[PDB]
Design a protein around this nucleic acid. Structure first.
Ligand SMILES: [Mg+2]
Ligand SMILES: [Mg+2]
Ligand SMILES: [Mg+2]
Ligand SMILES: [Mg+2]
Ligand SMILES: [Mg+2]
Ligand SMILES: [Mg+2]
Ligand SMILES: [Mg+2]
Ligand SMILES: [Mg+2]
Ligand SMILES: [Mg+2]
Ligand SMILES: [Mg+2]
Ligand SMILES: [Mg+2]
Ligand SMILES: [Mg+2]
Ligand SMILES: [Mg+2]
Ligand SMILES: [Mg+2]
Ligand SMILES: [Mg+2]
Ligand SMILES: [Mg+2]
Ligand SMILES: [Mg+2]
Ligand SMILES: [Mg+2]
Ligand SMILES: [Mg+2]
Ligand SMILES: [Mg+2]
Ligand SMILES: [Mg+2]
Ligand SMILES: [Mg+2]
Ligand SMILES: [Mg+2]
Ligand SMILES: [Mg+2]
Ligand SMILES: [Mg+2]
Ligand SMILES: [Mg+2]
Ligand SMILES: [Mg+2]
Ligand SMILES: [Mg+2]
Ligand SMILES: [Mg+2]
Ligand SMILES: [Mg+2]
Ligand SMILES: [Mg+2]
Ligand SMILES: [Mg+2]
Ligand SMILES: [Mg+2]
Ligand SMILES: [Mg+2]
Ligand SMILES: [Mg+2]
Ligand SMILES: [Mg+2]
Ligand SMILES: [Mg+2]
Ligand SMILES: [Mg+2]
Ligand SMILES: [Mg+2]
Ligand SMILES: [Mg+2]
Ligand SMILES: [Mg+2]
Ligand SMILES: [Mg+2]
Ligand SMILES: [Mg+2]
Ligand SMILES: [Mg+2]
Ligand SMILES: [Mg+2]
Ligand SMILES: [Mg+2]
Ligand SMILES: [Mg+2]
Ligand SMILES: [Mg+2]
Ligand SMILES: [Mg+2]
Ligand SMILES: [Mg+2]
Ligand SMILES: [Mg+2]
Ligand SMILES: [Mg+2]
Ligand SMILES: [Mg+2]
Ligand SMILES: [Mg+2]
Ligand SMILES: [Mg+2]
Ligand SMILES: [Mg+2]
Ligand SMILES: [Mg+2]
Ligand SMILES: [Mg+2]
Ligand SMILES: [Mg+2]
Ligand SMILES: [Mg+2]
Ligand SMILES: [Mg+2]
Ligand SMILES: [Mg+2]
Ligand SMILES: [Mg+2]
Ligand SMILES: [Mg+2]
Ligand SMILES: [Mg+2]
Ligand SMILES: [Mg+2]
Ligand SMILES: [Mg+2]
Ligand SMILES: [Mg+2]
Ligand SMILES: [Mg+2]
Ligand SMILES: [Mg+2]
Ligand SMILES: [Mg+2]
Ligand SMILES: [Mg+2]
Ligand SMILES: [Mg+2]
Ligand SMILES: [Mg+2]
Ligand SMILES: [Mg+2]
Ligand SMILES: [Mg+2]
Ligand SMILES: [Mg+2]
Ligand SMILES: [Mg+2]
Ligand SMILES: [Mg+2]
Ligand SMILES: [Mg+2]
Ligand SMILES: [Mg+2]
Ligand SMILES: [Mg+2]
Ligand SMILES: [Mg+2]
Ligand SMILES: [Mg+2]
Ligand SMILES: [Mg+2]
Ligand SMILES: [Mg+2]
Ligand SMILES: [Mg+2]
Ligand SMILES: [Mg+2]
Ligand SMILES: [Mg+2]
Ligand SMILES: [Mg+2]
Ligand SMILES: [Mg+2]
Ligand SMILES: [Mg+2]
Ligand SMILES: [Mg+2]
Length: 248
RNA sequence: CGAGGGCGCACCACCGGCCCGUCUCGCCCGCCGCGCCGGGGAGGUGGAGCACGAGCGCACGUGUUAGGACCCGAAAGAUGGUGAACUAUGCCUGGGCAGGGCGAAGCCAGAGGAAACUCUGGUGGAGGUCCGUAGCGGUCCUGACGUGCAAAUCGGUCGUCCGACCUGGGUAUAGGGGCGAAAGACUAAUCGAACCAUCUAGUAGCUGGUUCCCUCCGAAGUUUCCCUCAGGAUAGCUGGC
RNA sequence: CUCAACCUAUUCUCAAACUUUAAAUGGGUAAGAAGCCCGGCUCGCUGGCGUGGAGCCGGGCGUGGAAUGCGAGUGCCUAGUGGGCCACUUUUGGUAAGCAGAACUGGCGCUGCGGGAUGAACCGAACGCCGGGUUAAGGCGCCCGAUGCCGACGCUCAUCA
RNA sequence: CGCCGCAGGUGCAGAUCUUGGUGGUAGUAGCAAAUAUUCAAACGAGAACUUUGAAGGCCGAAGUGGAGAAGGGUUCCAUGUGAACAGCAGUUGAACAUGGGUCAGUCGGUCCUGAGAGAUGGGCGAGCGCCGUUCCGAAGGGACGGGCGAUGGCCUCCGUU
RNA sequence: CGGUAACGCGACCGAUCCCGGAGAAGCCGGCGGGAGCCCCGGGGAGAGUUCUCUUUUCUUUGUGAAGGGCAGGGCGCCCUGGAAUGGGUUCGCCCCGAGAGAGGGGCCCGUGCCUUGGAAAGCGUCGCGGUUCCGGCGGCGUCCGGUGAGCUCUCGCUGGCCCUUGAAAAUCCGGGGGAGAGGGUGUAAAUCUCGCGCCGGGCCGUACCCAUAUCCGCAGCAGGUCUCCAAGGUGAACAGCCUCUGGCAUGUUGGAACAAUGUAGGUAAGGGAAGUCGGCAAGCCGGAUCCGUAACUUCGGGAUAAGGAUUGGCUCUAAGGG
RNA sequence: CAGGGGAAUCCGACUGUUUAAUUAAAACAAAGCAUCGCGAAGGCCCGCGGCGGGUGUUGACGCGAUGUGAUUUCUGCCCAGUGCUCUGAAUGUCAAAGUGAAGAAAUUCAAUGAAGCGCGGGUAAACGGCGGGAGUAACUAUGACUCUCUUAAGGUAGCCAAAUGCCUCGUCAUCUAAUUAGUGACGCGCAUGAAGGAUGAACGAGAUUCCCACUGUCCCUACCUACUAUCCAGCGAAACCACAGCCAAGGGAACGGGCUUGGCGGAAUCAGCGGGGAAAGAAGACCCUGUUGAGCUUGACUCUAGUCUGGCACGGUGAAG
RNA sequence: AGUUUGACUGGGGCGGUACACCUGUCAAACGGUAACGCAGGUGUCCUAAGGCGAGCUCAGGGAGGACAGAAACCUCCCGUGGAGCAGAAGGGCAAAAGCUCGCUUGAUCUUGAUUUUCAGUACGAAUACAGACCGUGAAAGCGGGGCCUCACGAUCCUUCUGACCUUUUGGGUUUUAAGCAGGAGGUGUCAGAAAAGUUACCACAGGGAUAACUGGCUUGUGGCGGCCAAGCGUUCAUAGCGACGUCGCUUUUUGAUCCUUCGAUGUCGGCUCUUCCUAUCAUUGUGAAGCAGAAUUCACCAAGCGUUGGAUUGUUCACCCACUAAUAGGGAACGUGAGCUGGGUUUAGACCGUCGUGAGACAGGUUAGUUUUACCCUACUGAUGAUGUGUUGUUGCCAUGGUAAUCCUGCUCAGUACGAGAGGAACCGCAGGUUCAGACAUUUGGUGUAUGUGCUUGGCUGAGGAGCCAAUGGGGCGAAGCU
């Protein structure tokens, strides 16, 4: 009869992201005439640590083509780029690590970092550290490009979508065991209130579907339908299968 | 006074009769409408009826009922508000944590060895490291106290004491909601649904109470029915006129 | 020769759910005037028949047709109650129960009083306030009213009467 | 107030009844956590407790020391009083009464933003309103620069407009 | 305007605009500098002891801000030059043909010292007058040194840790650029972040308590309630114990007794858990030095395993430095 | 000022956290392991409402939802059941709307056929389940071996009278003089067992057994100290109270202070004490009843937010079928 | 989200249905009559098993007949029903009510009355008529279901049937709808709601109308006795026993019941402490033996005195070790929680096994879990006092109440009596111990703040000397007193 945890997360109050010390939204520069037709040269000024994010951010400085002014972007750092390096964004940009150019102008098999989901928005795909997408095929008739997302799923996008070349820095961060409840505490204190996690079987029936019983047992199948109401769908949601993955 | 006789009030029993409904049987009558028209009879039976009215208004008493309903009494339910000064958790900005032990990586030197490499002594000062202050906690005495110092405190003994550490202030989350390293915990001494006012004199087959005198009469705990078995209706028993 | 079963005549012992017979106590009805006896009339019922039956109309009969006691009949409104319990006797379950369950009458509940020392129910008796007399049940060594009778006849000795 | 009528918020021993008052308990339990007081004198009606002096002790700098924040709100400081209060007392008091006391360019607030809160535009909403905080706004009311001039005047030339 | 340079000098024209800096950054370690305090040796002034001894013991023995100068600390700043037989160097590190060692410079901080302030004040003593209660008047003094793993602040250097990287904005400044402005050689002009001079700074708060009696807990309630300063001895020590400065009167009463039963604290012959549900409670052990340490193990631990010896006072000796 | 120590068993890895006011634990958390959803027109969630809002200043090395719980080593069989999920294969059923027919219309009938349910696959680190019957070896006894049934499979590796074993204080060994205790072992195990089983250092105010040392826990009590209690001056409550207050027996609502019969009974008090007053504290919380509730659950009844699906409208322009 | 989750009931739950009915009995000779009284039955079945009429006689047995037998069919005789009538039981029934045939649909349409339960309400069932229309029989008649006693169902709603019926709202026609009358669809909790759990996180109103603990009745069961004497006892009923039976007592067992207590009587065990009982384990005095002695057994008077230390377990019980004269059994609100303790049971946390879909449950295991108040009355323990002898004191008496001692060992008797032997006593006496009691401190021990006297750590008074503080600084020895 009580609103469960997970239901309370959508209200926001105590579960909002900790964004006090975040350095800004990491994103490409807006597509403009210079990037749509030629290229524009920027210079990497610093590579910084964004709290709550494993990928380093790159602070790149461009020239505004219409006003005497300097523009500072907050690219996602592709691995290998350094300060004092020139990166080039545009259609005519060359195929080098850190450059930003449309997918339609890249050979099949190119590894990319900050890929646009829609032509014009800034980078949306393969942004987490060590991840990358791959260009698979081109359809110049429909102005389409087929790519392979980090999850393995294939996706057809417009050829005007831009991406950074290379993998995103931050390497194999998940390889190191955390080893300590304290290090998990510091990891999630920079992200949001999602830790520690109390098992539902350890709760009372009032605050969880799995709660209650004289033994800590689920009592009902933990696989739950997709259209189950909020407050009921806990456990394995819409699970196509369960159990140890044998076969692939 | 009076055997006998007569008219007989009210009322009671019975038998007839009349009105409406409904059956059964049957033959007649009426005429501006000749009809799938209208009326009538006899014999049963259904009616809270007729059969020379008794009602209306007012007052009083008793009984039953709806209302706060003889008085006091729930656990609850609903509507609208007030609280995070305590606590729970997130964030912001500050403050704080003796003295010792162990001795991680890194580094220096020496030695052994044919090499490969190993050994030894220093240095270094890591760690949700150990002993142990302050702080934070609260194990046991099942100690004190138990109309207390105290609506949870005190003594000794204890756990931890560089971290998932302690803490001020500022903020955010509000009641079927919040928040929970999860005990149904905490949410102003209140929590298995806070507090405040109202609906509300909530309902109670249940408990308690129910205020002057004398006189007269005087019970029942049984029948039948009831989601009836601590209650009613019903007959009985009672009193009054 | 012997033992079974069978039959016949006997013999022992029984029955809430067996019975020929069959009480006591018990239940119903009658013990007149709305009765009896005479005549007649009505009927579509019945029918050999003036036959039956019923109803109706007149008339005559009072020794008022057992005992005993009592004044009856009738209507309206109506409260409380709807937990009962006990005793003699009958009686079911139970080893039994101050158990549980029935029948009959009485009681307590609702009830005081005399007696049972004491006691809701036993025994006597029911109640206005009193005087006198007499009792019931029960008593009469002393408590404590009354045997302080020259009471009658026996029985009994208990170191748990 | 009696009598004849009329009308009631009309009669109390109870309700762990309501309000008020009062007993026994009972001059009882008690005034026992953190070592501790003593001598002399003064004032005074009155001294275990006030004041002064002399001793003996305690806190032992993580104080029983010296200062602040929050909170209190005059408790601060003098003088006086001895009703009540300070669970004994008091000549004392944070009590009572009468007066007095808080002085800033440079100590803070004020200013800035933080987590956040919150109008407008817009949207929603029966509605009080609430959602949202850059989102769906014609969102800059400013400026030495230049020009047209009013020459407003110490109209030279520089301020104004 | 000067210097090869780092950069310096008292100013050092300049808008819109652009770039940058400061504000503006965690925790922990180890070193170093400065101060305050503590300590030691003398010189004064005043006190204490003097039964005996003690040239003794105690107290006290200043220099604000803001300037100027000078030490001291730091520099990932410059010039010369070119280094292996590598050298320099730290407690640790670390550094160098991308320029070591050496020599010479420059800059930053300068809270330390001197000086203006400044002795005239303050303080300590010793006196003399009074304004019933004079910032009175006066004398004398306010001195010289030494030490440190010392404590506390502060400044600096250099490391470590992080799947943790530790605000923002007001506000202030520097630079880039050169739109412009200023005078015709003067009596100079525009301009000036240089020196001195003139005027002003409104509003609100401000006492006191800050807790075993000024706050919350119904109270003068053994509870709760955020901080700053921090002496001597012992000692590893902000431990416990004793003391100085400062504070207090024993925690809302006293007096007399010393029964039981309590509450708190001790001791107990011989035995040693036989007590009890149960070694509950109490007791044993304990610091430091020198030895000596097992099984097992995730090789880190176990581990202060277990077990043993020693420990005072006094008189010396030896080693460890500038 | 200032650790008693040692040998083991159970549980939890450790550090951390927890029921403020009876439970600090073995409970929670944890790192590690595993599973699930999701490529943004999205997953999960809030919201009365807005193309509103949180995750999200995010993007699969991420976010969301679960389970187990460090290391080591393993994690067996079962997809019948209930879940979940995948494709609709001629398809069964299936509402509104739409279509056709009859009728004078209301209406009636028929055809058509969305999700869903059925049907068919997958899935147990989803919920869960893992049994009997027979026959069968040359002492007996068991059954290596062979058939079955319910039916989806019959409990594998391990571990055990375990915090899980009724019988049970199981049986054997060991520890003791003596042991329902402990440890080791056995195992047809009422009713052990594999994301949890079995181990294994370090750790623990966790549960247990033993040994050394140590002692007033005890034999068996004594003495001492401080504060009380005590007495006094001053000050001064509360709880509770039908009336009260000596007993034995009787009867009685079956345990009397009162009543009957007996024993008896002598002011006013002080310090103690805990036998009685079925002492006080609270309209028993156990148990039952009530056509009295509330918290929670679901295969109860009746609904509902949200979601999936069909239809109508916004809703338009062209062609191929 | 809202609500529900029956009742009865020797508490409730589980189980049953005694919840609507029928038969016999209970039931006490009218009728009626109860319990979770006894023995049973019912929710159907039948176009015939209904209705007439006719004709027959059934069960069983005896005797016969080819196969044919103990049972096949045929025949005769006996046959009061001993068969059958659908079913449970009871009644009833013989040219019946049974069996077999023939014809049939009275199992139809109607109005009232009555009986049964009963309130004299309903339903159901039944009885007697009356009016139709039929069946059957020659007819009298019989028949509107079953030989009788059971076999079943309101309002509202639905559905069907009937009246050339009524209404369908200003009139008319026609669909439709409503109505009147009679059937059916059903409520089995059967006079008739539409209904799953859990709560140890729990709540309220109450209940001693009702359980768990004491007490009370009872005493089946437990325990302890007696009577008879078949037998056991080499023989011998009775030294010691006691089968088959039978009579009792007890209330330390467990039941049975539910009278008191639910505005509360604190619920196990242990510890502590007192008293009581006797059904006597030991001790004193005795009697009997299959008592030679020693030992043992049975019984009597008898409760004065004693009845112990430990391992395991919460235990009560149990069991073992060891001592002993013996290690008897019990009561006192299963004595004793303002006496304690809190191990157990019995709240809330948690784990495991089993059960359940789940919440959750488990006379299953395990771990952690607040034990409050006396100052009142009495009782008791002690302490002053009080009444009466004129006051006051000394010395006394004893009414009454209490009461206290207990058991064992060794030596001697005595290697004696007795006995074949092995063994093996007793009385008198002596020396001592156990348990208990009342004292006491010469001695030994304990205490020790005489704060007595040394020693000693840290600090403090300038040092010496003398001291002090550290909640008794520590420690050695220690008078007196207490013990
Ligand atoms: Mg978890
Ligand atoms: Mg839980
Ligand atoms: Mg739920
Ligand atoms: Mg569960
Ligand atoms: Mg008539
Ligand atoms: Mg009436
Ligand atoms: Mg009322
Ligand atoms: Mg409701
Ligand atoms: Mg707060
Ligand atoms: Mg640590
Ligand atoms: Mg520690
Ligand atoms: Mg306690
Ligand atoms: Mg719970
Ligand atoms: Mg009310
Ligand atoms: Mg009642
Ligand atoms: Mg009876
Ligand atoms: Mg009565
Ligand atoms: Mg009467
Ligand atoms: Mg009477
Ligand atoms: Mg009498
Ligand atoms: Mg009598
Ligand atoms: Mg008499
Ligand atoms: Mg007399
Ligand atoms: Mg009144
Ligand atoms: Mg009154
Ligand atoms: Mg007193
Ligand atoms: Mg006192
Ligand atoms: Mg001191
Ligand atoms: Mg202070
Ligand atoms: Mg003052
Ligand atoms: Mg006073
Ligand atoms: Mg005042
Ligand atoms: Mg100076
Ligand atoms: Mg150099
Ligand atoms: Mg001077
Ligand atoms: Mg001030
Ligand atoms: Mg206080
Ligand atoms: Mg207040
Ligand atoms: Mg005080
Ligand atoms: Mg004191
Ligand atoms: Mg005092
Ligand atoms: Mg001893
Ligand atoms: Mg000893
Ligand atoms: Mg023991
Ligand atoms: Mg013992
Ligand atoms: Mg202990
Ligand atoms: Mg060890
Ligand atoms: Mg020496
Ligand atoms: Mg743990
Ligand atoms: Mg583990
Ligand atoms: Mg805690
Ligand atoms: Mg607690
Ligand atoms: Mg606790
Ligand atoms: Mg693991
Ligand atoms: Mg996890
Ligand atoms: Mg379909
Ligand atoms: Mg599978
Ligand atoms: Mg196995
Ligand atoms: Mg086992
Ligand atoms: Mg066990
Ligand atoms: Mg033991
Ligand atoms: Mg074992
Ligand atoms: Mg598995
Ligand atoms: Mg008595
Ligand atoms: Mg009650
Ligand atoms: Mg209650
Ligand atoms: Mg009822
Ligand atoms: Mg409810
Ligand atoms: Mg359903
Ligand atoms: Mg009879
Ligand atoms: Mg009869
Ligand atoms: Mg016939
Ligand atoms: Mg018949
Ligand atoms: Mg009924
Ligand atoms: Mg014989
Ligand atoms: Mg009763
Ligand atoms: Mg009864
Ligand atoms: Mg009580
Ligand atoms: Mg009591
Ligand atoms: Mg005897
Ligand atoms: Mg008892
Ligand atoms: Mg108690
Ligand atoms: Mg008691
Ligand atoms: Mg316990
Ligand atoms: Mg529990
Ligand atoms: Mg299960
Ligand atoms: Mg505990
Ligand atoms: Mg005597
Ligand atoms: Mg005696
Ligand atoms: Mg000394
Ligand atoms: Mg000396
Ligand atoms: Mg001192
Ligand atoms: Mg001594």
């Amino acid at each position: 009869g009580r609103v469960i945890r997970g239901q309370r997360k959508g209200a926001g109050s105590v579960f909002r992201a900790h964004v006090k010390h975040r350095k800004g939204a990491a994103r490409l520069r807006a597509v403009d005439f210079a990037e749509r037709h030629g290229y524009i040269k920027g210079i990497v000024k610093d590579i910084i640590h964004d709290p709550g994010r494993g990928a380093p951010l790159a602070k790149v400085v461009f020239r505004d083509p219409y006003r005497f002014k300097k523009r500072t972007e907050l690219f996602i750092a592709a691995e290998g780029i350094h300060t004092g390096q020139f990166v080039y964004c545009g259609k005519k940009a060359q195929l080098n690590i850190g450059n930003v150019l449309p997918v339609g102008t890249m050979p099949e098999g190119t590894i990319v970092c900050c890929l646009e989901e829609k032509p014009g928005d800034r980078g949306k795909l393969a942004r987490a550290s060590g991840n990358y997408a791959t260009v698979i095929s081109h359809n110049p008739e429909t102005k389409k490009t087929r790519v392979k997302l980090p999850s393995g799923s294939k996706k057809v996008i417009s050829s005007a979508n831009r991406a950074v070349v290379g993998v995103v820095a931050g390497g194999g961060r998940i390889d190191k065991p955390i080893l300590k409840a304290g290090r998990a505490y510091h990891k999630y204190k920079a992200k949001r209130n999602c830790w520690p996690r109390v098992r539902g079987v350890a709760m009372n029936p009032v605050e969880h579907p799995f709660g209650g019983g004289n033994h800590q047992h689920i009592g009902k199948p933990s696989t739950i339908r997709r259209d189950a109401p909020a407050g009921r769908k806990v456990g394995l949601i819409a699970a196509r299968r369960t159990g140890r993955l044998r076969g692939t």
